[PDB]
Amino acid sequence: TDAYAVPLSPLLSCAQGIALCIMVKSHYICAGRLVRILRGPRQDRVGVIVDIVDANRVLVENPEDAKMWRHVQNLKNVEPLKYCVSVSRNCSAKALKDALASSKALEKYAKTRTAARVEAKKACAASTDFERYQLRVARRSRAHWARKVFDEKDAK
């Protein structure tokens, strides 16, 4: 019995995680800049990375306002974003995680895209059975209206 993401929709796929990871050298991906964690008990949060300790393991934190502690989260559920603060080209791994994040790099990302999908899938998990109707009359609307537009294309 297959849940699908096409192509090649998948048998026997647990709906509580994925084996996303493809191996990469640690240094290029991340450097005490910023990252987000897919699979954590706190779910899909982003915390700027304080430092790298050993290999897979990282120390991941965030200033406040998210109930995110300074903690040891592993790269196996911690995946970089290109909204860095202190990785790569910028001269150093920075300190004062709030002030460096007071450069709105998180505030910009939290209001930019790929975070409107984080809460999208978290909205479809808190949508009670009334907004699921709202979502179905919303798709059904855009659906047939799409068909009306196709009819217009046929006319053209």
Binding site: A19, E131, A138, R142, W145
Partner: protein, 202 residues
């Protein structure tokens, strides 16, 4: 009337896939298998050729036409790996086996039977690829028999291209939707555009 979950086996490791297919056949589902050619096996080809030439060496001494009948043609090597992962000497297990088909490549009767399926928990590439030697099962079975590697390597070439004739023809039929569905916004009630955006389906 029936419902077949037409699985696919490109880049599926021969054993992490026959274990998953067996338990689903055994859960009463009717799996059809295609592209058993591209099934992979761990280890180099030499090691996998000897792990099979040592099996092609076993036969009933007194009457070989009763001995273990070895099969080339990965299509049934995959059936062989499944039958062995299965309760054969019950009618429960013989029904489960007889629900596979396990073709070679994508035959014409299962190219137009709907979208097909892969098993992510068996794809050999849940992660990075290091260097390690894998063996396409259709290339290991060419070397122990299975005269028909040329055959299916061309039938599936006259298809991977004949399908590609239909992805670019009827390509101007696709954007007749992803645009019509795109501009299916801003003409319709904002009542509903807001909840499409809310739940991301915008």
């Amino acid at each position: 009337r029936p419902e077949i979950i037409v699985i696919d086996l490109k880049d599926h490791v021969l054993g992490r896939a026959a274990a998953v297919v067996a338990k689903q056949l055994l859960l009463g589902k009717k799996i059809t298998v295609v592209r058993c050619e591209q099934l992979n096996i761990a280890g180099t080809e030499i090691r996998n050729k000897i792990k099979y030439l040592q099996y092609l060496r076993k036969r009933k001494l007194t009457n070989p036409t009763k001995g273990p009948f070895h099969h080339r043609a990965p299509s049934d090597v995959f059936v062989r790996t499944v039958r062995s992962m299965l309760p054969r000497y019950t009618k429960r297990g013989m029904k489960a086996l007889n629900s596979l088909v396990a073709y070679e490549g994508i035959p014409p009767n299962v190219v137009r039977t709907g979208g097909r399926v892969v098993i992510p928990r068996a794809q050999r590439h849940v992660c990075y690829r290091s260097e390690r030697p894998y063996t396409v099962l259709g290339n290991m079975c060419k070397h122990v028999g299975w005269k028909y590697s040329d055959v299916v390597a061309n039938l599936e070439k006259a298809r991977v291209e004949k399908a590609s004739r239909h992805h670019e023809k009827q390509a101007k039929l696709r954007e007749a939707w992803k645009a019509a569905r795109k501009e299916a916004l801003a003409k319709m009630p904002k009542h509903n555009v807001e909840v499409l955006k809310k739940f991301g389906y915008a």
